[PDB]
Design a protein around this nucleic acid. Structure first.
Ligand SMILES: [Zn+2]
Length: 462
RNA sequence: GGUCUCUCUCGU
RNA sequence: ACGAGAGAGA
């Protein structure tokens, strides 16, 4: 991805989009009980903590584009994935507006507790003023679709969250691109059925882990990804995508039977316009973080990417012997013979992709089930039933979460949630957690889940 | 102050 | 089953 131009909102006619500049995050009653190295992200140009110009680090993620036009490797890769998806029998027909707005069995309704985007967010119009879960009223929507149209600009905000200290000094906060409700609606009407399919089939056919539950999914993966694991991280995946990958995606949608009218929506995300404060800017390439389809489209593209990298880097790759699962840029993949990711990354560069070793090390060492992680969790065989696999969220990350809070009103729910993540690390580790929580007055007032009950309830999932 | 997923809680 | 909240992940 690359910024093409920046223009004053005066020159473009766009309304100013201003977001909050102070964090909702405050130290919690456990801040000093547990160790951590994360603080609230920088939200403001003159955060005392800054060591670089803020807006320059913010947008530094747009590293540029290399390829615009799929070569033969990318074409073949897009095709292998497309034929694999055909067995899913995706409904390529347009989903009704009612379903797209208000939900189906396999697609959650448009979030109503969340902004309605450009231009409503400036006009003081919220989603609730247009949509109604009880009515399933589609009439006011179909009016605003024809008042403001489609292809409205993304409203850019800085994401309020914890970031490592390195990331706070270096102004490396994350942006989110608020979608216009109009595009969300239209993207959902066009691809809603493909969302449904993907949500109901996490696994190695979709190649996607969207819709998976780690408590039960982790036991399938060593069976879904047989052979030798390989994995790696991307730096700045979304923003690093060159337009070629959106061309590639158009190939996949076309092949599985999408109409040329529907395939044409992809350029709509490859080429996008954003409002940040008082300026308008145009981005070519890069997935816009906050549009409808972000997870699934990123996951689909990864499926294309891993394939193309394999057959351009190595001789005699059989793509039918590749098994992989993606969740956006997160990947776990397997092949009958070990894959050398040092070489994939070299190829990755030629495609404008920045790939680094999985273990966060600077060498591409071996990846195995003992040290693989996916969605931040590891894989730990149960000591009693080894075919069942614990997803192990590191206590380090759990300690990070518990030290802060956006509203201490909800300390109970927060701590319980963390305990449902933490027990998988084992009885000894969990009780060390719990007793540390008890070591403090608010702690002795919380209801904490019993280890053996957590384990008992986990075993009955099977 | 986005898109989604999963899980928990609280109500009728 | 439906409403409201939260946490985590991408
Ligand atoms: Zn443009």
């Amino acid at each position: 991805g690359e910024i093409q131009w920046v223009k004053p909102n005066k020159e473009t006619g766009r309304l100013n989009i201003n977001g909050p500049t102070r964090t909702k995050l405050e130290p919690s009653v456990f801040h000093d009980v547990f160790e951590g190295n994360k603080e609230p992200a920088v939200l403001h140009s003159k955060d005392p903590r800054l060591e670089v110009d803020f807006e320059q680090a913010l947008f530094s993620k747009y590293v540029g584009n290399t390829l615009y036009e799929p070569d033969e490797y990318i074409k073949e890769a897009a095709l292998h994935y497309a034929n694999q998806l055909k067995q899913l029998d995706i409904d390529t027909s347009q989903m009704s507006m009612e379903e797209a707005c208000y939900g189906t069995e396999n697609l959650e309704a448009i979030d109503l507790h969340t902004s309605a985007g450009y231009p409503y967010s400036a006009l003081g119009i919220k989603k609730r003023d247009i949509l109604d879960s009880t009515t399933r009223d589609v009439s006011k929507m179909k009016f605003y679709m024809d008042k403001y149209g489609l292809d409205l600009p993304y409203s850019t905000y800085v994401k309020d969250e914890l970031r490592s200290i390195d990331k706070i000094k270096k102004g490396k906060s994350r942006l989110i691109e608020a979608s216009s409700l109009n595009d969300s609606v239209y993207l959902r009407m066009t691809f809603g059925h493909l969302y449904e399919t993907f949500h109901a089939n996490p696994g190695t056919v979709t190649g996607s882990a969207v819709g998976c539950n780690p408590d039960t999914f982790w036991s399938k993966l060593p069976i879904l990804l047989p052979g030798s694991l390989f994995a790696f991280d991307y730096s700045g995946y979304d923003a690093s995508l060159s337009p070629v990958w959106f061309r590639a995606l158009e190939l996949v949608l076309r092949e599985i039977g999408y109409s040329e009218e529907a395939v044409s929506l992809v350029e709509g995300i490859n080429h996008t316009h954003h409002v940040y404060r008082n300026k308008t800017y145009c981005v070519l390439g890069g997935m816009p973080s906050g549009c409808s389809g972000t997870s699934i489209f990123n996951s689909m593209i990864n499926n294309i990417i891993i394939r193309a990298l394999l057959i351009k880097t190595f001789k005699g790759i059989d793509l039918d012997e590749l098994n992989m699962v993606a969740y956006g840029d997160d990947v776990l993949a397997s092949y009958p013979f070990p894959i050398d990711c040092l070489e994939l990354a070299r190829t990755g560069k030629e495609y404008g992709l920045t790939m680094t070793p999985a273990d966060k090390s600077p060498c591409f060492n071996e990846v195995n089930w003992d040290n693989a992680t996916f969605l931040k969790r590891g894989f730990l065989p149960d000591e009693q039933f080894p075919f069942l696999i614990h997803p192990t969220m590191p206590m380090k990350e759990i300690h990070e979460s518990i030290r802060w809070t956006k509203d201490a009103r909800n300390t109970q729910d927060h701590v319980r949630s963390l305990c449902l993540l933490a027990w998988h690390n084992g009885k000894q580790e969990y009780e060390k957690f719990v007793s540390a929580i008890r070591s403090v007055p608010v702690g002795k007032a919380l209801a904490i889940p019993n280890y053996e009950n957590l384990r008992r309830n986990w075993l009955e999932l099977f």
